[PDB]
Each structure stands twice: as structure tokens, then as C-alpha cells.
Design an enzyme around this catalytic site. Structure first.
Site, PDB file in Angstrom:
ATOM      1  N   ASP A 232      50.951  20.596  32.398  1.00  0.00           N
ATOM      2  CA  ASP A 232      49.799  20.813  31.534  1.00  0.00           C
ATOM      3  C   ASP A 232      50.073  20.338  30.100  1.00  0.00           C
ATOM      4  O   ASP A 232      51.207  19.987  29.760  1.00  0.00           O
ATOM      5  CB  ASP A 232      49.463  22.305  31.556  1.00  0.00           C
ATOM      6  CG  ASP A 232      47.984  22.603  31.287  1.00  0.00           C
ATOM      7  OD1 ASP A 232      47.229  21.717  30.825  1.00  0.00           O
ATOM      8  OD2 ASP A 232      47.586  23.759  31.539  1.00  0.00           O
TER       9      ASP A 232
ATOM     10  N   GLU B   7      48.167  16.213  33.230  1.00  0.00           N
ATOM     11  CA  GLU B   7      46.895  16.503  32.558  1.00  0.00           C
ATOM     12  C   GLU B   7      46.771  15.664  31.299  1.00  0.00           C
ATOM     13  O   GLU B   7      45.923  15.916  30.449  1.00  0.00           O
ATOM     14  CB  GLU B   7      46.752  18.003  32.259  1.00  0.00           C
ATOM     15  CG  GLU B   7      46.803  18.870  33.510  1.00  0.00           C
ATOM     16  CD  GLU B   7      46.147  20.225  33.338  1.00  0.00           C
ATOM     17  OE1 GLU B   7      46.796  21.233  33.698  1.00  0.00           O
ATOM     18  OE2 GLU B   7      44.990  20.294  32.865  1.00  0.00           O
ATOM     19  N   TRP B   8      47.635  14.656  31.222  1.00  0.00           N
ATOM     20  CA  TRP B   8      47.740  13.696  30.131  1.00  0.00           C
ATOM     21  C   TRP B   8      46.392  13.171  29.582  1.00  0.00           C
ATOM     22  O   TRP B   8      46.103  13.373  28.400  1.00  0.00           O
ATOM     23  CB  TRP B   8      48.639  12.541  30.595  1.00  0.00           C
ATOM     24  CG  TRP B   8      49.081  11.538  29.548  1.00  0.00           C
ATOM     25  CD1 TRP B   8      48.604  11.393  28.270  1.00  0.00           C
ATOM     26  CD2 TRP B   8      50.071  10.515  29.722  1.00  0.00           C
ATOM     27  NE1 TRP B   8      49.249  10.356  27.639  1.00  0.00           N
ATOM     28  CE2 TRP B   8      50.151   9.797  28.508  1.00  0.00           C
ATOM     29  CE3 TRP B   8      50.904  10.138  30.789  1.00  0.00           C
ATOM     30  CZ2 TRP B   8      51.037   8.723  28.327  1.00  0.00           C
ATOM     31  CZ3 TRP B   8      51.783   9.065  30.603  1.00  0.00           C
ATOM     32  CH2 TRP B   8      51.839   8.376  29.383  1.00  0.00           C
ATOM     33  N   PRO B   9      45.571  12.500  30.426  1.00  0.00           N
ATOM     34  CA  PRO B   9      44.310  11.950  29.904  1.00  0.00           C
ATOM     35  C   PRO B   9      43.360  12.996  29.313  1.00  0.00           C
ATOM     36  O   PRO B   9      42.727  12.724  28.299  1.00  0.00           O
ATOM     37  CB  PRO B   9      43.672  11.266  31.131  1.00  0.00           C
ATOM     38  CG  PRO B   9      44.354  11.831  32.301  1.00  0.00           C
ATOM     39  CD  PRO B   9      45.738  12.205  31.862  1.00  0.00           C
ATOM     40  N   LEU B  10      43.271  14.169  29.937  1.00  0.00           N
ATOM     41  CA  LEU B  10      42.450  15.280  29.445  1.00  0.00           C
ATOM     42  C   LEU B  10      42.736  15.664  27.987  1.00  0.00           C
ATOM     43  O   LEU B  10      41.804  15.884  27.198  1.00  0.00           O
ATOM     44  CB  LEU B  10      42.612  16.511  30.354  1.00  0.00           C
ATOM     45  CG  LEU B  10      41.990  17.865  29.974  1.00  0.00           C
ATOM     46  CD1 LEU B  10      40.471  17.789  29.938  1.00  0.00           C
ATOM     47  CD2 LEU B  10      42.457  18.962  30.942  1.00  0.00           C
ATOM     48  N   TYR B  11      44.017  15.740  27.632  1.00  0.00           N
ATOM     49  CA  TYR B  11      44.409  16.180  26.287  1.00  0.00           C
ATOM     50  C   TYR B  11      44.378  15.086  25.224  1.00  0.00           C
ATOM     51  O   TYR B  11      44.348  15.382  24.028  1.00  0.00           O
ATOM     52  CB  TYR B  11      45.758  16.908  26.310  1.00  0.00           C
ATOM     53  CG  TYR B  11      45.653  18.248  26.986  1.00  0.00           C
ATOM     54  CD1 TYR B  11      45.277  19.386  26.270  1.00  0.00           C
ATOM     55  CD2 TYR B  11      45.886  18.373  28.354  1.00  0.00           C
ATOM     56  CE1 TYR B  11      45.158  20.621  26.900  1.00  0.00           C
ATOM     57  CE2 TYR B  11      45.764  19.593  28.992  1.00  0.00           C
ATOM     58  CZ  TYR B  11      45.406  20.714  28.264  1.00  0.00           C
ATOM     59  OH  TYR B  11      45.297  21.920  28.909  1.00  0.00           O
TER      60      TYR B  11
ATOM     61  N   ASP C  57      38.451  22.080  32.917  1.00  0.00           N
ATOM     62  CA  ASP C  57      38.692  22.987  34.036  1.00  0.00           C
ATOM     63  C   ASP C  57      37.399  23.244  34.805  1.00  0.00           C
ATOM     64  O   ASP C  57      36.349  23.491  34.210  1.00  0.00           O
ATOM     65  CB  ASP C  57      39.224  24.330  33.521  1.00  0.00           C
ATOM     66  CG  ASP C  57      40.627  24.239  32.893  1.00  0.00           C
ATOM     67  OD1 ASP C  57      41.202  23.128  32.772  1.00  0.00           O
ATOM     68  OD2 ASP C  57      41.152  25.312  32.513  1.00  0.00           O
TER      69      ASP C  57
HETATM   70  O1  GLA Z   1      46.691  28.314  31.991  1.00  0.00           O
HETATM   71  C1  GLA Z   1      46.536  27.492  33.149  1.00  0.00           C
HETATM   72  C2  GLA Z   1      45.322  26.585  33.007  1.00  0.00           C
HETATM   73  O2  GLA Z   1      45.614  25.690  31.930  1.00  0.00           O
HETATM   74  C3  GLA Z   1      44.745  24.571  31.739  1.00  0.00           C
HETATM   75  O3  GLA Z   1      43.489  25.066  31.258  1.00  0.00           O
HETATM   76  C4  GLA Z   1      44.590  23.796  33.054  1.00  0.00           C
HETATM   77  O4  GLA Z   1      43.783  22.621  32.904  1.00  0.00           O
HETATM   78  C5  GLA Z   1      44.033  24.722  34.131  1.00  0.00           C
HETATM   79  O5  GLA Z   1      43.798  24.008  35.352  1.00  0.00           O
HETATM   80  C6  GLA Z   1      45.041  25.854  34.334  1.00  0.00           C
HETATM   81  O6  GLA Z   1      46.248  25.298  34.864  1.00  0.00           O
END
Ligand code: GLA
Ligand SMILES: *[C@@H]1O[C@H](CO)[C@@H](O[C@@H]2O[C@H](CO)[C@@H](O[C@@H]3O[C@H](CO)[C@@H](O)[C@H](O[C@H]4O[C@H](CO)[C@@H](O)[C@H](O)[C@@H]4O)[C@@H]3O)[C@H](O)[C@H]2NC(C)=O)[C@H](O)[C@H]1NC(C)=O
Ligand SMILES: *[C@@H]1O[C@H](CO)[C@@H](O[C@@H]2O[C@H](CO)[C@@H](O[C@@H]3O[C@H](CO)[C@@H](O)[C@H](O)[C@@H]3O)[C@H](O)[C@H]2NC(C)=O)[C@H](O)[C@H]1NC(C)=O
Ligand code: NAG
Ligand code: NAG
Ligand code: NAG
Ligand code: GAL
Ligand code: GLA
Lengths: 391, 390
Positions: free
Chosen positions: B139, B172-176, B200
Site C-alpha cells: 500500500d 497501489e503505486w498508480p493510485l497514490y 477503495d
Molecule cells: O488500511 C487498509 C486499506 O488501505 C488502503 O485504503 C487500501 O487501498 C485498501 O484496499 C485497504 O488495504
């Protein structure tokens, strides 16, 4: 309205949400607005236990009429889609022991654009009585004068009265008034058996939520004007269609019971799940809605994505609804002191609590000082009935 | 990521959406984040045919960690909730023929506020391999810069490789980085087996729609980079829970197949309806998602509240999805010339069309000249497989 009608909220079936203004009987014969649809729907109302449950009114919404009035200046049904006319449809509906609802508009056109009743209030009302109509839903489109709107709704109320026919008068008066002023509900109650307050429901959880939130936000205005012969209308029941999860369906049924709402299903009785049918036909939930005290419920509490609504029933009984508005995770625990419920009157000195939704379960005796502990599914509602007892 | 893993989209179970960060094992022993919860799911994955259907990775999300590292500066599982530790849990899961996923964070803390991996990437990668971990969800919370984000994701990627253990790397690289800079997906794929692109998911139809909408809006950027060893991740399957109607669950299953998406169920395998279970285990739909060619589908059309999506498959086949986005009325008629489908080749000179969702039904032979017609339920999807006749 003091016509002796709608002493309990009206129960029936209305085509609008599920069928709308589908005029294409060639390519969509099964969903087009036709006399065959209403005939077949009436057959199922009887054969599938709907009438026995209390759903009495088979209701036509917009798009039943011909493009223009006839040579007498009277409304006519579409000749292609209703070739046998309204009178014969009413005879058929009455022979099945059911009642017939129709639709008209206060303005110059209906919302879908077919002939309006402005300037024709007296003949239209008589036309419906002649055809043997038992309920009128009266819409507010294409009337941009605040005066005309009020005068029209008032005029049509008296126009129906003067026919001598017992006809339930369903008004959209308050909904088309908001754009101008806050509606006078004392005035509306005088003329209408029930009244649409808010935007059209659609087949969505979003829509249920917005109807609930508008109701609870405005509850100080509307709750107490409701009573035998005059009800707030939060719009059609949409259980049995496509857009709501089981839990969201439970929420609509539970809360429409709390709100003393007219129960007009808009669905397909030919294609409906046993689960949806059982919920719509739940006699305990329907009994809450149909409670003879005729006192509308209200939101008691809100917070932490929970809602607590309650409704006073006859004989010192209460219905209590707990909603979980958190749309993530799993079932959430909720506890409340039973002394907080029913203004401390339910459960004094005791109450017997029976869960009705999502499943029927006896919860037992609760003393006045005791706590009720429950779990509620995301977007679901727990509906409880509290019976005041000396035991 | 060229690690020989995720040659098809990863399939499994992940705790987050349904179970979240429930630490309350005293009041809620059966739904708190604990060793027991993961044992219960592992057993049902075997015994309820989930493993047989392809769901192989049992994954721990956030909130497994003890509040602090051990004496030797290594991550540790909570002592009360994971008394036997992760290596032991991984042993158990492996003995069931399954694989263990875990969770960490590129920054200074996890999103739930537990120990982050920044400054410990090599330590953490080696302890993960020593534990016998098979997948890592990495994450992006509490990372103070984009350079730290990129550097950390790269660093951990190489640190896992150096362990020698096969570990699926979920990023989750691209998301952030999306809020600040547009991602380089060629760069991300080089380092990651799959990547979270969007917010999410939760237990709502609103959520499915916004994920679908984001994906179709951004498809020019993301579609072509996807392929064996590197997938777009639109988040967890939430079928079997509370907020989706039957038709909306169908839409999720159908479109996650079109999208060549990883299939991580987040639900309660102990309390799941036979209907939900049969959809999630749908052999023919899974086979589309798992298609060896691994080419992501895309939105072909949208208009009058309908969407058409398609995906090229192995052996000249195509999958086609038709969504009804109109949330009022009844099943609604949609028609399309089969010549417009599959770039004009699916049904030249002909194709056999089989409906898979909402129910399985052979539709018959369609000529180059034909039109496909269908009624689609509000919020539902019709999913079809087209086979060229030769
Ligand atoms: O705290 C855990 C939570 O953290 C981020 O929001 C992720 O994108 C979620 O999918 C989950 O893993
Ligand atoms: C046209 O408009 C007029 C004017 O409003 C309207 O007449 C009203 O009808 C109501 C109900 O039919 C009358 O109210 C009745 O009053 C008597 C005496 O007080 C009551 O006993 C009646 O019944 C009560 O008890 C019954 C239970 O056993 C219940 O069935 C019932 O709901 C009552 O609780 C009843 O209330 C009212 O007197 C008149 N109003 C006037 C001014 O005359 C008429 O019905 C309208 N409609 C049509 C088509 O004619
Ligand atoms: C660490 O990184 C290296 C380099 O990226 C990984 O090596 C790569 O591994 C894959 C799969 O094992 C190799 O692909 C395979 O090649 C053989 C024939 O050469 C073929 O038969 C297979 O079907 C497959 O295509 C790939 O060539 C290889 N890359 C290089 C440049 O060596 C390695 O697997 C990583 N290790 C770990 C533990 O993640
Ligand atoms: C209907 O139209 C007439 C003129 O054709 C007009 O006088 C009137 O304002 C309209 N009625 C309403 C209620 O809008
Ligand atoms: C972690 O916190 C330290 C201390 O301020 C900081 O120097 C470092 O940049 C942080 N790392 C990340 C990735 O946020
Ligand atoms: C994107 O990243 C790759 C790999 O690091 C690199 O080869 C390429 O030049 C980059 N392209 C862009 C758009 O900057
Ligand atoms: O908030 C609106 C409602 O509040 C309740 O406490 C009261 O009993 C109702 O009659 C109604 O006024
Ligand atoms: O066109 C008919 C339509 O008109 C309005 O929008 C009403 O609120 C609906 O319930 C329906 O009667």
C-alpha cells in the site's frame, strides 16, 4: 380529505416505475401500456394472494390516453392500446373484486404530454365516475402558475365529490409547490386523501436514501398532518425489480410501514421472486403500515451511520426501525435503552419485543430499565414490534 | 513483472472490504482480524469448491501487525490475534494446498496506522520469504513524496526478487501518484504483478459504477499495458455481501472478467448465498477472466444509458458485455450489428453466440449480416461469448 376513504394508507399496484410511458406494443408488447397488461396484472393480484394481503387498487398511471379528446371534449383511452375502453376495464377489474385507479394532470398536459385537465375539471371527474373509476392520481406538470395549481387541485377535489362516486384522490400538490413556496399541509389535507411530497422514486438505493433523508429532514412539517383520510406519499414500492439488494428491499418495506405510507407496488407481478413476494405480503409489516391509529412515525435518532425510527401504534404498541447506513464491512451492533423507545411508554413497566425484519423472531420480555441489543446489515433495517405488557 | 507469476489474473480471497480493521476479538471473536478467521476461510476455500474454481490465494490485508517491530527490527503479527505467527499460518494454508497473501506499506505507517516498511524494505522482504508468504499487497499511505513512492515500490520489488521466493507483488503505486502526476504504466508493470488504479471499493452499486466509469474514461492509458504478469486492479469482488442487487453482482462479475482483473473476493465464506456462490464459481465466466492470451477488454460503445464492452480471447473468440445503466423501468431492448463486434472479425463470415450471464443460453449462429438483440435488466449486464465459425 373527509370522504370516508383512505382511513388506512391506500394499498395497490401502480404501473409507472416499472412500465413508465412505453407505447411500443409492436416491439415491446409485454411491457407496453395496454389493457392486456392491466387485465393480466389484475388476474395475478387475485391468483397470487395480493388482494388477500390488502393490495386492492389496480392503478393506471400516465400514457393511457388518446392524443386528443373526442367530439364531446371528453378524455378517451388510446384506441390501439385500450381498444375496449376504460369502462370495460373497470368492469373486469371489479369482477375480480378489485378497484381501479386512473391518472390525470392539473395543467394543460400530463407530464408525458397527453391531454391535461385544466379547463375540463368537471367533465373529467364525471367521465371517470361514469367509467367506474375508484381512484385518481392527479399530477402537476405544465402548470407554471402557483394560483392555477392550488385552484386546480381544489377544483378537482370538489369536482370528484359532486359526482357522488367514492374516489380516492391522490395529489402531487406539495411536490409542485416547493419550487414556489412551502406547501400549506393543512390546506392540502382538506382536499386530498394522500400527497406526493418528493421527487419520483426510481429503482435505486440512492433514491430510497434521498426519500428517507428528505422525510426526516422535513418531519416537523409533515409527520403530524398525516392521519386517517390524509397521508404523506413517499412514492411507489419498488421491491421485486432490479436495483435493490435484499437488505435495501427490507429497508423500504420497514420504513414505508413506519411512515404510514400508501403502499403502491410498481413491479411485474408476472415476474417476481418468492422472496420479494413474501416481503411485500408480510402480514405483520402490513399490519404496522395499516395500523388503525393512523399516526405516522418519525426519526428518533441519527448518528454513527445509524438511524432509529419509531411509530406509535394502537393499544400502546410501537414499531421500531433501526437502519445501518454504513455501506462497507459487515453487520454492525447497536444498543439502545428500551426506556428511550416509545417516549418511555412502550416497555413501562415491560414490553414483549418481536423482531419482524429481516426475519421474524421473538426477542422476549424487556423490563423498563433494560437494554435492547441488535445487529444490522449494511443498508439493512431491523424492524421490531414492542407490545406493552403488565407481565 | 517478469517473475513467472500472475500469468493470468490472480484469484483469491482478501479480508479488507468485509472484515476491515476489526480488532475487537473480545466482543466479536468470529469477525475480528485473527488467525482463526483465516483458518476458517482456508477450510471453506477447500471444502466449498473455491480452490477448485481457481481461488488460490488466501490474503491478509491491513491490521495483522503487532503495534511495533520485534527485538531484531522485524515486523511481527499481533501476539493475541495471531498467537502462532505468520510462518505457522502459512504452513497451515500450504497444507491445504493454498497460498498466503500478506499486506505492507511503502511509507512510514500502514493506512490503518501500523508499522510501515520505509527504511526496512530488504528486512521486510526477507522476513516475508522466510515466513513462506506467497503474495504481498503493498500500500501507499504515509509516503511524504512521489520520489519516495517510486523508489520504495522499485526497491521492494527488487528486494522480493532477491529473496528467491515466488511472491506475487500487488502494488497501489498508480493510485497514490494519480492525484499529482499521471503514472507511467510501462514503469509500473516492470516492477509489479498488478496495480490498484482507483479508490477503495465498498459494498455499493455507486462504487461499481464509479470504478467502471473511471476505467472507461482512462482506457486509452491502461488497456494495452495489461497482459500476462501485469494487470490493472479495479479492486475486490464484493459479491455475497449486502449492498448489491443480484443484477449488480452480475455486472461486477461480468465486467471484472472483461477487464482481466484480479479476482479477490472480499466476503464471508461461512455465510454466503448459493446464488452468490454459483456466480463467483461460474466456470465459463472465470475462463474468460483467466483467458491465457491476457488481453484486457475495453468499452466499445455508450449511449442511451447502455454500454457495450468487449474483450479478445484465445482462438479468435470474443467476450461481449452489455450493461443497462438506466435505473428505472424494466428489461430494456438493445441491438447491435454483429459486424461492429470484435473489430469486424468475430462474426466474419459468421459466429456462434452463447449467453453466459445472467443465465447460460445458446443464442445460435449469427451471420456477418446479422444483428444481435437482447433485453438487459436495469443495472444488469448480459455477457456473451462469440466463437468464429471458421
Ligand atoms: O488500511 C487498509 C486499506 O488501505 C488502503 O485504503 C487500501 O487501498 C485498501 O484496499 C485497504 O488495504
Ligand atoms: C363530499 O363532501 C362531503 C363533505 O365533506 C362528504 O361528506 C362527509 O362524509 C363523512 C364520511 O362519510 C362524514 O363523516 C361522518 O360523520 C358521522 C357522524 O359524526 C360519523 O358517524 C361517520 O362515521 C364514523 O364512524 C365510522 C365507524 O363506525 C367510520 O366509518 C367513519 O370513518 C367515521 O369515523 C362519518 O365520520 C361527514 O359528516 C361528511 N361531511 C359533511 C360536511 O357532510 C362526502 O362524503 C364527500 N364525498 C362524496 C362522494 O359525497
Ligand atoms: C527475478 O528477476 C528475473 C529477471 O526479471 C526473473 O527471471 C525471469 O523469469 C522468467 C520466469 O522464470 C523467465 O521467463 C521464462 O523463460 C523461459 C525460457 O528462458 C520460458 O520457457 C518460460 O516460459 C518463461 O518465458 C525470464 O526469462 C526471466 N528473465 C530473465 C531476464 O532472466 C526471475 O524469475 C525473478 N525471480 C524471482 C524469484 O522473482
Ligand atoms: C393552458 O393554456 C391556456 C391558453 O391556451 C392558458 O390560458 C393557461 O394559462 C394554461 N393553463 C395552465 C394551468 O397552465
Ligand atoms: C518517514 O518519516 C521520516 C521522518 O520525518 C522522513 O524523513 C521520511 O521521508 C518518511 N518516509 C516516507 C516515505 O514518508
Ligand atoms: C516510462 O517508463 C519506462 C520504464 O521506466 C521508460 O522506458 C519510458 O521512457 C517512460 N516513458 C515516459 C512516458 O516517460
Ligand atoms: O419530529 C417530528 C415528530 O416528533 C415526535 O417526537 C412527535 O411525537 C411527533 O408527533 C412529531 O412531531
Ligand atoms: O408522467 C407520469 C409521471 O409524472 C410525474 O413525474 C409523477 O411524479 C410520476 O409519479 C408519474 O406519474
Amino acid at each position: 380529505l373527509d370522504n370516508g376513504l383512505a382511513r388506512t394508507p391506500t394499498m395497490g399496484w401502480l404501473h409507472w416505475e416499472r412500465f413508465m410511458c412505453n407505447l411500443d406494443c409492436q416491439e415491446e408488447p409485454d411491457s407496453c401500456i395496454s389493457e392486456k397488461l392491466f387485465m393480466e396484472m389484475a388476474e395475478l393480484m387475485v391468483s397470487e394472494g395480493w388482494k388477500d394481503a390488502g393490495y386492492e387498487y389496480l392503478c393506471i398511471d400516465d400514457c393511457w390516453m388518446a392524443p386528443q379528446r373526442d367530439s364531446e371534449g371528453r378524455l378517451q383511452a388510446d384506441p390501439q392500446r385500450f381498444p375496449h375502453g376504460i369502462r370495460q376495464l373497470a368492469n373486469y377489474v371489479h369482477s375480480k373484486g378489485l378497484k381501479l385507479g386512473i391518472y390525470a394532470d392539473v395543467g394543460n398536459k400530463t407530464c408525458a404530454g397527453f391531454p391535461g385537465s385544466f379547463g375540463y375539471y368537471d367533465i373529467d371527474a364525471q367521465t371517470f365516475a361514469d367509467w367506474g373509476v375508484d381512484l385518481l392520481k392527479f399530477d402537476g406538470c405544465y402548470c407554471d402558475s402557483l394560483e392555477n395549481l392550488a385552484d386546480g387541485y381544489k377544483h378537482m377535489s370538489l369536482a370528484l365529490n359532486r359526482t357522488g362516486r367514492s374516489i380516492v384522490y391522490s395529489c402531487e400538490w406539495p411536490l409542485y409547490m416547493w419550487p414556489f413556496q412551502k406547501p400549506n399541509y393543512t390546506e392540502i389535507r382538506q382536499y386530498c386523501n394522500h400527497w406526493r411530497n418528493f421527487a419520483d422514486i426510481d429503482d435505486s438505493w440512492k433514491s430510497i436514501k434521498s426519500i428517507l433523508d428528505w422525510t426526516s429532514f422535513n418531519q416537523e412539517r409533515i409527520v403530524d398532518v398525516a392521519g386517517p383520510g390524509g397521508w404523506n406519499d413517499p412514492d411507489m414500492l419498488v421491491i421485486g425489480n432490479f436495483g435493490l439488494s435484499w437488505n435495501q428491499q427490507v429497508t423500504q418495506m420497514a420504513l414505508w410501514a413506519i411512515m404510514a405510507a400508501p403502499l403502491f407496488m410498481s413491479n411485474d407481478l408476472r415476474h417476481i421472486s418468492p422472496q420479494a413476494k413474501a416481503l411485500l405480503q408480510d402480514k405483520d409489516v402490513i399490519a404496522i403500515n395499516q395500523d388503525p391509529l393512523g399516526k405516522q412515525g418519525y426519526q428518533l435518532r441519527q448518528g454513527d451511520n445509524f438511524e432509529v425510527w419509531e411509530r406509535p401504534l394502537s393499544g400502546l404498541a410501537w414499531a421500531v426501525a433501526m437502519i445501518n447506513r454504513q455501506e462497507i464491512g459487515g453487520p454492525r451492533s447497536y444498543t439502545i435503552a428500551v426506556a428511550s423507545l416509545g417516549k418511555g411508554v412502550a416497555c413501562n413497566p415491560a414490553c414483549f419485543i418481536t423482531q419482524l425484519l429481516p426475519v421474524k423472531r421473538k426477542l422476549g420480555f424487556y423490563e423498563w430499565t433494560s437494554r435492547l441489543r441488535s445487529h444490522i446489515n449494511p443498508t439493512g433495517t431491523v424492524l421490531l414490534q414492542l407490545e406493552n405488557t403488565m407481565q
